Every structure is written in structure tokens, then in C-alpha cells.
Amino acid sequence: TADLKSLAKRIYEAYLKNFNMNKVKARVILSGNPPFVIHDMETLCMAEKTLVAKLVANGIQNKEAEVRIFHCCQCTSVETVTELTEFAKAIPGFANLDLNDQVTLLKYGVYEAIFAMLSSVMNKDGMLVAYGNGFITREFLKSLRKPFCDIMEPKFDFAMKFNALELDDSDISLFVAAIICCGDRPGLLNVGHIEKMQEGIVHVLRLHLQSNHPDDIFLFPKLLQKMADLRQLVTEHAQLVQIIKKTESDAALHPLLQEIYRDMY
Amino acid sequence: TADLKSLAKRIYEAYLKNFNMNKVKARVILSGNPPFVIHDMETLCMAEKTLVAKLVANGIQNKEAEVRIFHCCQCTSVETVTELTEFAKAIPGFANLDLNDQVTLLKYGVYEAIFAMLSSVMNKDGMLVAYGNGFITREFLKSLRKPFCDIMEPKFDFAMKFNALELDDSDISLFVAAIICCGDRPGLLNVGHIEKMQEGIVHVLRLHLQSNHPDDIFLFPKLLQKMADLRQLVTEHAQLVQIIKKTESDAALHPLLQEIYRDMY
Numbered sequence: 001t002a003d004l005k006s007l008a009k010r011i012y013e014a015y016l017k018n019f020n021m022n023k024v025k026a027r028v029i030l031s032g033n034p035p036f037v038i039h040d041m042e043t044l045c046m047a048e049k050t051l052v053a054k055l056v057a058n059g060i061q062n063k064e065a066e067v068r069i070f071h072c073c074q075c076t077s078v079e080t081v082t083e084l085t086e087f088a089k090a091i092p093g094f095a096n097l098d099l100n101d102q103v104t105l106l107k108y109g110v111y112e113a114i115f116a117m118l119s120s121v122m123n124k125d126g127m128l129v130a131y132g133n134g135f136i137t138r139e140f141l142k143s144l145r146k147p148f149c150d151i152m153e154p155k156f157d158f159a160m161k162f163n164a165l166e167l168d169d170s171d172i173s174l175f176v177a178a179i180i181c182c183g184d185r186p187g188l189l190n191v192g193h194i195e196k197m198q199e200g201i202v203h204v205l206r207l208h209l210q211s212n213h214p215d216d217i218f219l220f221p222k223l224l225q226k227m228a229d230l231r232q233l234v235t236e237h238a239q240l241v242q243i244i245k246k247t248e249s250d251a252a253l254h255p256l257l258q259e260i261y262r263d264m265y
Numbered sequence: 266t267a268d269l270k271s272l273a274k275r276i277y278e279a280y281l282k283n284f285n286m287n288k289v290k291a292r293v294i295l296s297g298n299p300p301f302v303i304h305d306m307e308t309l310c311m312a313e314k315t316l317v318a319k320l321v322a323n324g325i326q327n328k329e330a331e332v333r334i335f336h337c338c339q340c341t342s343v344e345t346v347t348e349l350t351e352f353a354k355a356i357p358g359f360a361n362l363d364l365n366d367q368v369t370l371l372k373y374g375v376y377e378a379i380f381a382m383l384s385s386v387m388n389k390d391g392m393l394v395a396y397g398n399g400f401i402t403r404e405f406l407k408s409l410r411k412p413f414c415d416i417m418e419p420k421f422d423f424a425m426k427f428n429a430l431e432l433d434d435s436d437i438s439l440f441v442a443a444i445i446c447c448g449d450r451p452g453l454l455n456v457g458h459i460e461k462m463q464e465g466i467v468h469v470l471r472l473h474l475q476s477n478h479p480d481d482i483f484l485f486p487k488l489l490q491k492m493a494d495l496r497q498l499v500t501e502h503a504q505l506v507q508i509i510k511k512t513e514s515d516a517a518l519h520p521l522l523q524e525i526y527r528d529m530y
């Protein structure tokens with residue numbers, strides 16, 4: 001349909017406008033101001049002095065390396081929350097929802113969207129960081145002391161299988177919109193209107209995958225499963241973050257993310 | 266360092282001296298000879314009769330409205346090229362470069378600088394024009410016939426995110442200097458000296474952002490990404506201008522801008 005093709009294009013354009021990183025851009029960088037490679041402690045500290053200088057400008061009062069990394073991770077999440085919040089306005093019906101339902105959908109959806117989109121900047125060896133200006137190796141992240149090395153590998157495991165689906169940005173934009181439109185989120189006021197909004201987005205996603213990936217007749221049910229996998233990945237991630245919060249006094253959690261996690265799992 | 270703080274101040278002062286519009290001045294006007302508002306064809310024609318009278322003094326031989334606007338756009342670029350060329354003399358090492366390298370750096374840099382600086386006079390509803398004496402609405406520019414309505418919106422999209430960084434003129438001056446000092450421009454003779462000049466400016470920019478924006482530890486990598494975004498914005502802009510040149514006989518391109526675009530993309 002013209003209105004359904006147009007809806008898919010509108011969501012794709014809103015994704016291209018509101019997220020600083022997209023998959024085409026990420027793959028250009030990942031192929032080879034080129035990205036500084038962080039693969040050990042020396043190169044981590046070098047990258048920090050150039051890319052987050054204030055974070056390491058405190059001398060002997062600088063935090064432990066793992067805590068500095070954790071802080072950088074949190075800051076990226078706060079930025080993506082801002083991007084996701086503006087993107088959601090392109091979803092038909094989202095801006096017509098009650099303000100409290102908009103909050104609830106974004107609360108439960110943002111981390112599922114975050115890890116879906118982080119797949120775009122990950123390969124089997126590492127990931128882009130710092131607005132495309134660093135590449136940090138998967139092995140270096142595994143080398144961090146517990147519990148910080150435990151954040152990383154489950155997301156790589158998810159991303160490698162997600163990337164094997166060979167989605168492009170036109171697919172991922174609709175997938176992220178579908179994540180945001182989940183009517184079964186706890187605490188929703190107008191569940192019925194949200195289910196209809198969801199049905200509309202999922203309908204556009206199904207038709208789009210049919211046109212864009214004629215070679216994979218299971219791609220839509222596969223992505224439905226990936227949405228469930230992401231919900232579980234986020235539940236587990238929240239649990240690990242709570243361990244870090246309780247056992248690592250220096251790993252302070254940003255207030256916006258504290259509110260997202262609050263009463264989640 | 267005293268010499269690095271002084272370098273940042275020197276570039277800021279050169280920016281204040283050489284560009285007719287700056288962000289403080291622009292925000293004063295944009296808040297409210299006040300700016301005449303161009304929001305439709307009637308008010309466009311009124312503004313033209315006062316601000317560019319010769320352009321509409323030909324009666325039935327006047328060009329189409331979209332072509333007149335395109336001509337005004339080009340004239341602003343020619344003026345900014347003059348301003349940028351004098352500004353570049355404040356960059357340490359630029360005036361010591363070979364004349365041909367100075368030309369090459371300005372050739373590839375001016376339109377990236379132009380769209381970075383135009384952000385200062387843009388808000389979500391429109392932009393200042395005509396030396397602060399007009400404000401033209403974003404919706405009116407979208408209303409122009411194709412292909413002229415296609416020039417405008419990508420620059421607003423860039424500017425809204427660029428302006429959300431809340432840079433001031435002391436930041437933007439160093440950013441524009443960094444744009445001009447790109448050592449990877451095609452055809453450079455003394456790449457090594459240019460990379461050292463670039464390193465010096467980028468070093469001053471990094472330290473300045475650290476001092477001036479202690480609240481945003483990612484601001485430097487964000488601006489590195491904006492430089493890449495601007496390069497792509499300019500590539501796309503050159504392509505659209507070439508379409509207009511081929512398909513619109515009345516939209517003659519000024520010879521100086523023709524030389525800038527020649528062998529660019």
C-alpha cells in the first residue's frame with residue numbers, strides 16, 4: 001500500500017535523522033579521523049586522554065579503569081535515550097498517547113532498542129565507541145576485572161546472531177519502532193490503543209521484510225524471537241547493573257538511568 | 266598553557282573580526298531595523314523589493330521566485346568565501362603553506378564551514394538572511410518547487426542537532442579552523458606540514474572544549490563526528506547543485522562557486 005510503504009519510509013527517515021550512528025556509517029568506519037584502537041590498558045588510557053580528557057584529568061583521584069569505562073557506557077545510554085525519545089514521535093499514534101504511557105513505553109523499551117542498535121557497531125572482534133572515534137576490542141572488554149567483564153560478552157553473543165540476519169537501516173528502524181510499541185509493558189493505562197499502534201507498526205514491519213528480504217521467508221518470526229531475546233537480555237543486564245551498584249561504590253549510576261531501572265525487573 | 270589559551274583567543278578574535286554574523290548577534294535578532302519575516306510568496310516579494318531591489322527590477326523579465334532565492338543563496342556563499350579566506354590567516358601555519366595548498370584547503374573546507382556557521386542563524390522555525398534583516402521560515406523553503414525545496418531541509422536537520430550542543434562562538438571559531446585544517450583533502454602537496462598544523466588546532470580545540478564545557482565529556486568526539494557529517498552533507502549538496510545546474514537553465518552558477526565545485530565530488 002502507498003500509505004504503508006510511506007509509513008516505512010517515514011520511520012526510516014526518522015531513524016536516519018535522530019540517531020547519530022547508523023549501520024551504513026558504522027560499516028564504513030569498521031572497514032577502514034580514523035578510529036583509535038583500544039586493545040589494552042595503554043591504549044585505553046591514550047584514548048581517554050584524547051576523547052574524554054576531563055574523566056582522566058584528576059591524577060591520583062581518577063577512578064579505576066573499569067569504573068571509567070562503566071561511566072562512559074552510562075553516558076552513551078543517556079544520549080541514546082534522548083535520541084530514542086525524539087524518534088518515537090514518528091511512530092503513528094505514539095505522540096497521541098497519554099504522557100504517562102509514553103513514559104512507560106520508553107522506560108521498558110529503551111534498553112531493548114539500545115542493544116539492538118549497538119549490534120550495528122559491533123563485529124566479532126570489537127565495537128565502535130565514542131561517536132565512531134574509537135574501536136574497543138572484545139578481548140580487552142573480557143579482560144576487565146569482575147564484574148565489569150560480565151557486562152559485555154552477552155551483548156556480543158546477541159549481536160553476532162542478530163548481524164547474521166543482514167538487516168539494513170530500513171529494517172532496523174521498523175524493528176526499533178516495534179520494540180517501543182509493546183502493549184504488554186507493565187503499568188500501561190490505555191493498553192487497547194497501544195495494541196492498535198503496535199499492530200500498525202508490526203504490520204508495516206512484516207510487509208517491509210517481505211519486500212526487502214525475499215530470500216528469507218522466516219525473517220519476520222526470527223525478529224519476533226529476537227524481541228523476546230532482547231527482553232531477557234535486558235532483564236539480565238539490569239540484574240548485573242544492580243550487582244555493580246551494590247558492590248562498587250565508585251560506579252555511581254546516572255539519575256536518568258536509575259529511574260529507568262527503578263521498578264523494572 | 267598560556268600559548269594554547271592565547272591561540273584559542275586569537276582564533277576567536279579573528280572569527281569575531283572576519284565574519285559579519287556571529288552567534289551572539291544572531292540570537293539577539295532571533296529573540297526579537299527588525300527582521301522582516303518571509304513566510305509566503307507575498308512576503309518574499311516584499312522583502313526582495315526592499316533588500317535586493319535590483320534582482321526584481323526587471324518586470325516580466327524577473328526570474329522565477331525559486332531561481333531568485335537560489336541566486337541570493339549563491340551570493341551569500343561568495344561573501345562567506347571572502348570572509349573565510351581572511352579568517353584562515355589567523356590559523357598558525359596556514360599563511361606559511363604553499364599558495365596551492367592554501368587554495369586546496371579552502372576549496373574543500375569552505376562549504377563545510379558555511380553549513381557549520383549557518384547553524385548559528387537557524388532555529389527550528391526558520392533562519393536569518395540578508396545580513397540579519399530577514400527571517401525566512403523553514404516551511405516556506407519546503408514549499409518551493411522541486412528541486413529547490415530539496416536544498417534546505419538537510420541543513421536544518423544538521424543545524425538542529427548541532428545547535429543542541431550549545432556551542433558558543435569561542436568553540437565554533439576553533440571548529441571552523443579545524444575544518445579548514447584537514448590534511449586528507451585530495452591534491453595536497455605538503456601533507457605533513459598540514460597534518461602538524463591540524464594537530465595544533467585540534468589540540469587547542471580539545472583543551473578549549475574541556476575548559477568551556479565541563480558538563481559534556483563527549484563533546485570533542487561529538488564534534489569530530491560532526492566534521493564527518495559535514496563532509497557528507499557537502500558531498501550531497503554538491504550533487505543537488507549539479508542537478509539544478511543541468512536541469513535549470515536560469516539558475517546560473519557564480520564562477521567562483523563553479524571553481525569550488527569543480528573536481529570536488
Ligand SMILES: CCCCOc1ccc(C[C@H](CC)C(=O)O)cc1CNC(=O)c1ccc2ccc3cccc4ccc1c2c34
Nearest residue numbers: 048051052069070072073074076077129130151152155156
Ligand atoms: C556490552 C557490549 C557493549 C559494551 O558497551 C556497552 C555496554 C553496556 C552499555 C549499557 C550501560 C552499561 C553501564 C547501561 O546500563 O546504561 C553500554 C555500552 C556502550 N559502551 C560504549 O559506548 C563504550 C564502551 C567502552 C568504552 C571504553 C573507552 C571509552 C573512551 C572514550 C569514550 C568512550 C565512549 C563509549 C564507550 C567507551 C569509551
Ligand SMILES: CCCCOc1ccc(C[C@H](CC)C(=O)O)cc1CNC(=O)c1ccc2ccc3cccc4ccc1c2c34
Nearest residue numbers: 313316317334335337338339341342394395416417420421
Ligand atoms: C539550506 C538551509 C539554508 C538555506 O539557505 C542556503 C542554502 C544553501 C546555500 C548554499 C548555496 C546554495 C545555492 C551554494 O551552493 O553556494 C546557502 C544558503 C544561505 N541562503 C541565504 O542566506 C538566503 C536564503 C533565502 C533567501 C530568500 C530571500 C532573500 C531576499 C533577500 C536577501 C536574501 C539573502 C539571503 C537569502 C535569502 C534572501
